[PDB]
Design a protein around this ligand. Sequence first.
Ligand SMILES: *[C@@H]1O[C@H](CO)[C@@H](O)[C@H](O)[C@H]1NC(C)=O
Ligand SMILES: *[C@@H]1O[C@H](CO)[C@@H](O)[C@H](O)[C@H]1NC(C)=O
Ligand SMILES: *[C@@H]1O[C@H](CO)[C@@H](O)[C@H](O)[C@H]1NC(C)=O
Ligand SMILES: *[C@@H]1O[C@H](CO)[C@@H](O)[C@H](O)[C@H]1NC(C)=O
Ligand SMILES: *[C@@H]1O[C@H](CO)[C@@H](O)[C@H](O)[C@H]1NC(C)=O
Ligand SMILES: *[C@@H]1O[C@H](CO)[C@@H](O)[C@H](O)[C@H]1NC(C)=O
Ligand SMILES: *[C@@H]1O[C@H](CO)[C@@H](O)[C@H](O)[C@H]1NC(C)=O
Ligand SMILES: *[C@@H]1O[C@H](CO)[C@@H](O)[C@H](O)[C@H]1NC(C)=O
Ligand SMILES: *[C@@H]1O[C@H](CO)[C@@H](O)[C@H](O)[C@H]1NC(C)=O
Ligand SMILES: *[C@@H]1O[C@H](CO)[C@@H](O)[C@H](O)[C@H]1NC(C)=O
Lengths: 114, 49, 113, 269
Amino acid sequence: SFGGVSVITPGTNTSNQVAVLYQGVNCTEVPNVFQTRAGCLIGAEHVNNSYECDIPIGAGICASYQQSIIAYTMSLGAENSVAYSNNSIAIPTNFTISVTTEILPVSMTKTSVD
Amino acid sequence: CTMYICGDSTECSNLLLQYGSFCTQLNRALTGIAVEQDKNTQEVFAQVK
Amino acid sequence: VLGQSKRVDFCGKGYHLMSFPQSAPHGVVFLHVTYVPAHEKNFTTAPAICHDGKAHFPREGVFVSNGTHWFVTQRNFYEPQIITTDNTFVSGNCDVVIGIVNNTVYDPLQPEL
Amino acid sequence: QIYKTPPIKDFGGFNFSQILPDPSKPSKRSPIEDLLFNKVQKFNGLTVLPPLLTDEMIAQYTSALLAGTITSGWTFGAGPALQIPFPMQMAYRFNGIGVTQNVLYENQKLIANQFNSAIGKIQDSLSSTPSALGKLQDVVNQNAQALNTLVKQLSSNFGAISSVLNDILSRLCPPEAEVQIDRLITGRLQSLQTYVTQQLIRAAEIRASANLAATKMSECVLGQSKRVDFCGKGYHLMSFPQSAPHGVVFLHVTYVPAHEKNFTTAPAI
Ligand SMILES: *[C@@H]1O[C@H](CO)[C@@H](O)[C@H](O)[C@H]1NC(C)=O
Ligand SMILES: *[C@@H]1O[C@H](CO)[C@@H](O)[C@H](O)[C@H]1NC(C)=O
Ligand SMILES: *[C@@H]1O[C@H](CO)[C@@H](O)[C@H](O)[C@H]1NC(C)=O
Ligand SMILES: *[C@@H]1O[C@H](CO)[C@@H](O)[C@H](O)[C@H]1NC(C)=O
Ligand SMILES: *[C@@H]1O[C@H](CO)[C@@H](O)[C@H](O)[C@H]1NC(C)=O
Ligand SMILES: *[C@@H]1O[C@H](CO)[C@@H](O)[C@H](O)[C@H]1NC(C)=O
Ligand SMILES: *[C@@H]1O[C@H](CO)[C@@H](O)[C@H](O)[C@H]1NC(C)=O
Ligand SMILES: *[C@@H]1O[C@H](CO)[C@@H](O)[C@H](O)[C@H]1NC(C)=O
Ligand SMILES: *[C@@H]1O[C@H](CO)[C@@H](O)[C@H](O)[C@H]1NC(C)=O
Ligand SMILES: *[C@@H]1O[C@H](CO)[C@@H](O)[C@H](O)[C@H]1NC(C)=O
């Protein structure tokens, strides 16, 4: 048995705690141990809550620093059931003016080699 | 590929085999391009029933 | 920047009004100004109004009711107006359209003559 | 937000049962999506990593987009989702193509029936057409071809006495092993560089396709397009996304003029 080892970290500006993902293997073969379809994740606490994805693990699992590192199934967003009927319409009585920023690359450094 | 590299030499061709499928890969890549060129023309001009 | 786009989410989220370019190192920044609907309310609606045996449709708006009275409003902003022959048009009788409701359609010339 | 459809599917005669999630299936895919999914190394250091989003998650996004489109038209794409009767939404989309709204209401039953039949035809067309999803299969086949080629290159001698490194080490001694090995390293390194270069070029093509798909999602699904032949042939009314393996399928609903007649005309009276 062999595979890749990935280290999950919050950043040294925050913490020196890490979690390790053993990619594509069983936790029983590795020798807070959580088996994912991406491999065995060690050092992360699995929770039954769901949050926006911070550090992607794979197969729907993300990790974040909450102190300790946690692993969770990522949320896709809040639910909203629209009040549909065959004679009901919703009409805005007001508005806002929004300004948003979009950033695009245009060019790169012009290098040359002898 | 074989002709470009070896011409009509059998001695060269026999050595070239030791490199595996490199020639096949190159032939495939150029073929894919050639096919695309006809697709490109059709996408632009053949828009009328 | 050089026009107003009707392409969805091309020039920011919401209904595009305008945009402004700003230069950046090896790139460009666009500031997109959009219109976003804010405070919606529930209203009762209908596809058509039946009056004098004729079916009436909105010229440029939607028929709405506040529970007691029928009005016609523009779609993206609530601004209720009295239903008249000037802001509706007639097509056919009241037998075909499903959900047609009975209401008065005012003719502005009526009281004048 | 993840939008959900109403418990009661009353849309004025319009039937979306083939595109909406089927609760009897454990994957919660639509009838069409389920069909699409049915239709479409390790020991040498080559591995495959899982996607961040699962097929279930992708299906959930698709369901949210369909639920929004059906219950709130194109409003959910530009702000708050505002409910409107489906028949009235279709009336708005008729105006968008230069056809008066009374045409929709007077022909509502016919239009709903034409729509319902057209959707049914899609399900049958895909079921009976093996090549329908060739574009997605081609991506799968190309990637498989590249990996199989990469592995087979491990069988090449590249001028060495043997393709097998263990044979060289067990037979030849250290000064003369470093000659045979270097030949294998050179060939194997070249083979790997070739693979990576090809993957970068293919990746670019997929990215362009994904950018186009994202544009169509915005302009065909989250609104009504006036761009000719961008959202199907004919005058665009609306579109519905369906998930597929490594791809997306768009069902474009368009208005097509049918039975024309000759008339005499004049520029002015
Ligand atoms: C690093 O942490 C400091 C606070 O200790 C914070 O002010 C700073 O912005 C952080 N740097 C980054 C890149 O987040
Ligand atoms: C390895 O993990 C799989 C699930 O991914 C499980 O079915 C199998 O029993 C595990 N093997 C061992 C020895 O635990
Ligand atoms: C999560 O839920 C499962 C049951 O689905 C339960 O067995 C497990 O202990 C729970 N874990 C946590 C951290 O709540
Ligand atoms: C619209 O919203 C703004 C705040 O964004 C508020 O100040 C204004 O009074 C509102 N207009 C109306 C008519 O309610
Ligand atoms: C409209 O009515 C529904 C109930 O049918 C309610 O849940 C919803 O919040 C109302 N929406 C607004 C904007 O008042
Ligand atoms: C509807 O609008 C009319 C005219 O302004 C008003 O007199 C009536 O009270 C309103 N009905 C309700 C339920 O608010
Ligand atoms: C709307 O639905 C109700 C049932 O909830 C039905 O009685 C009514 O006739 C329907 N009206 C239209 C226009 O579909
Ligand atoms: C609308 O008015 C007509 C008479 O002009 C009447 O026959 C019809 O039943 C009314 N419709 C409703 C729903 O009351
Ligand atoms: C929608 O279409 C399906 C397939 O033809 C049919 O089985 C179902 O009964 C229809 N639903 C309604 C409400 O007619
Ligand atoms: C219109 O008239 C021409 C003859 O001038 C005829 O060939 C054509 O088929 C007619 N088209 C239709 C739709 O009747």
